[PDB]
RNA sequence: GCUACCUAAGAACAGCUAAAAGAGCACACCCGUCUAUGUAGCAAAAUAGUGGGAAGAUUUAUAGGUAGAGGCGACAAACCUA
RNA sequence: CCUCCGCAUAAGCCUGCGUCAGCUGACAAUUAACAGCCCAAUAUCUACAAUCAACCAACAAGUCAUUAUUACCCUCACUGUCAACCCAACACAGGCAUGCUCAUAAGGAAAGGUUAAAAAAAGUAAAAGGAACUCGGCAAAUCUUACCCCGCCUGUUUACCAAAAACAUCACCUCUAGCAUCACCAGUAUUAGAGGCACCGCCUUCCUUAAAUAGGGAUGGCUCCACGAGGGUUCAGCUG
RNA sequence: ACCUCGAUGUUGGAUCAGGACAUCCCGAUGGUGCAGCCGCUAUUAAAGGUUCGUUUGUUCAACGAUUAAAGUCCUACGUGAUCUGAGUUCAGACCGGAGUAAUCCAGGUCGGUUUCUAUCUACUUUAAUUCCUCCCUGUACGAAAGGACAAGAGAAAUAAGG
């Protein structure tokens, strides 16, 4: 029974899971885009968002500095986290990460995911775009909207 | 007021920079050694 | 425990040709509008994603050349500029990564 | 625990199953003769 | 070339306590009390923990010797290439 | 993140992750100072350990030496030098001597991806109780008393179901032997061999539990000082 | 001495229990040397239940404390491809005895390897019971001592389901 259990069991245990997520998150902070098994990316997305929040908390905050020091194995990223990522998302309140599925890894056919930080300089991903508003169905729904607006 | 941790390689990782940092740790022990006897012992103990 | 009798080919066929074992037909396959190669509805196009990964690899090689050494992550934003492009007003105060090819159409 | 009864050592190998020892006694000479009659490529160890 | 015993000439035994010990605690090392796993196994006898000895009748590398109505044996009818 | 290790020598194997192009073929490589490979005779020398060798201490008495003559001008040959390696039918969780490193500067990766069903293995934590489990406190947790049976003790044994009360053991006892050039022994009755036994020493119904088929007490034979992964009983604590 | 000696030791215990009723308790009745309470005996009833400890392999038994009761059996003396091996069974060794000895023992004791990845069958989600307390009531019954039913209420315990 695992009712309400929200954390995946990864690696060799709790500490190993934390370290795996830490390495993935350090790579994410360094490169602004990471490919990894879908489950691991899903687990690490929350920690990525939490790091962005801690960076927003400020460079001078001792708790935020300690959290960044722990979670960024390469210490050159801490200035990056506090001076690039957090200022970039200062306007936003959430959704700093974009996660998408990727074709299964050729090696072991694992479910792969690409996770990036929004607003990075890298080329945009082939995001899924909804159907154009000029399609037949969308135009019919536009007619519905206009008629409802006029009537009421 | 912002105390960024030093930008150095990790001591325990498996990398060229980590190996260099461990070598630096060894050389730091050599430097901290007081007696010339201890310095020579540390410098020549490992036989290769 | 060991088997008590050889299982006949009829029984074996009944077992291993069952629908529960047959490979299910996928109905979420579609054609990518951008390049026309096949993709799944919820998965990114393999061809387009390979394009993006290769361009990202080139940009990252340029970034590594610019940084020149481990632990040299900049404290300032990064902007990728291709041949025939000049930093804009907002591109000021951001490290520039130069690419020798022209601006890709999908890149913006 | 068992299986590795062979602890190789060329000194023992030659002193126990060598050409000199086989020729040392009439029985070993007959051993070599039997190997030669059978056509063994390796007459002595 | 395993193993039983022996011959020649070698090697090992941290640290502490006691002092000159077939002494005590305890590494390396040797062994294999009990438990669990394993039982076509990692293994044709092992793994983990626990445990006995660990300066001695100790452990051990090298070469040699004793051969089957025999050898060797601190006798377990033990070992002498599973 | 791990470090059992690691680097060399020895032993063993013998080209066994060097390059190239298709595991296979070709090409390349280990360069002696290190090590091995020695000595002209004839006689003749050599009692006094080692232990920091100095006090001291011994016993099991121990690893290191030349001389006197006669001969004697050619000097640097040969061989090992690689590796991810050997013995276990295997890229085997086993076996493998030595010197340094005593945790490393060297060497490595427990997780193919996902889920987190049962059963199973290992581990951590547990309300109150604390052996009521059980053949037995096996295991786990703690760091714990006292006493019996056996064996004096250290050791040895059925390699692979028994490590013990069995074998051995100092000590004691019995029997045999008056002696040299291959053991006994280069010894001689205080010696040697065969054997027994086992140090030494000495002589001649009640208690425990509430409950107890458990435990303890009212020449040989006694005698438990010490010791024991031996077999029983037990206070207290401890704990799934 | 009829099947099985061309890999099933056995006894206890653990686990799960299926079944019979010749019923230990709970239910309904007849008789009684049944005034009442205790009981004894017989008919009917197998839905439910039928304890934990000390010694000891031990089933059993004795003992301690309980219970409404601590039922008799069958199920390969149920079940060991689910577990244990405590007695018992091989190799070791003792005491006692037999034997010239090798050895032996229905005796006592210390130790002693318990494999299997499930092919087939079968199967894997099917309205509770009892004790105690109070009331009736220290009422009926009885001379007293004792002491009831039925019905009702309250408390628990177990079992099932959450
Ligand atoms: Mg996992
Ligand atoms: Mg050997
Ligand atoms: Mg010592
Ligand atoms: Mg000692
Ligand atoms: Mg011996
Ligand atoms: Mg015997
Ligand atoms: Mg015998
Ligand atoms: Mg054999
Ligand atoms: Mg791995
Ligand atoms: Mg897996
Ligand atoms: Mg508890
Ligand atoms: Mg107790
Ligand atoms: Mg019991
Ligand atoms: Mg008990
Ligand atoms: Mg124990
Ligand atoms: Mg003894
Ligand atoms: Mg002993
Ligand atoms: Mg044995
Ligand atoms: Mg042995
Ligand atoms: Mg044993
Ligand atoms: Mg008891
Ligand atoms: Mg007949
Ligand atoms: Mg009846
Ligand atoms: Mg019967
Ligand atoms: Mg038994
Ligand atoms: Mg008996
Ligand atoms: Mg027994
Ligand atoms: Mg034992
Ligand atoms: Mg079994
Ligand atoms: Mg099974
Ligand atoms: Zn596409």
PDB file of C-alpha atoms (C1' of nucleotides) and ligand atoms in Angstrom, chain E residues 31-32, chain F residues 157-159 163, ligand 19:
ATOM      1  C1'   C E  31      40.579 -21.317  12.256  1.00  0.00           C
ATOM      2  C1'   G E  32      35.526 -22.188  11.553  1.00  0.00           C
TER       3        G E  32
ATOM      4  C1'   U F 157      40.410 -33.863  15.333  1.00  0.00           C
ATOM      5  C1'   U F 158      36.141 -36.394  11.410  1.00  0.00           C
ATOM      6  C1'   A F 159      39.008 -30.833   4.507  1.00  0.00           C
ATOM      7  C1'   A F 163      35.348 -29.077  17.704  1.00  0.00           C
TER       8        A F 163
HETATM    9 MG1  LIG H  19      40.751 -28.892  10.333  1.00  0.00          MG
END
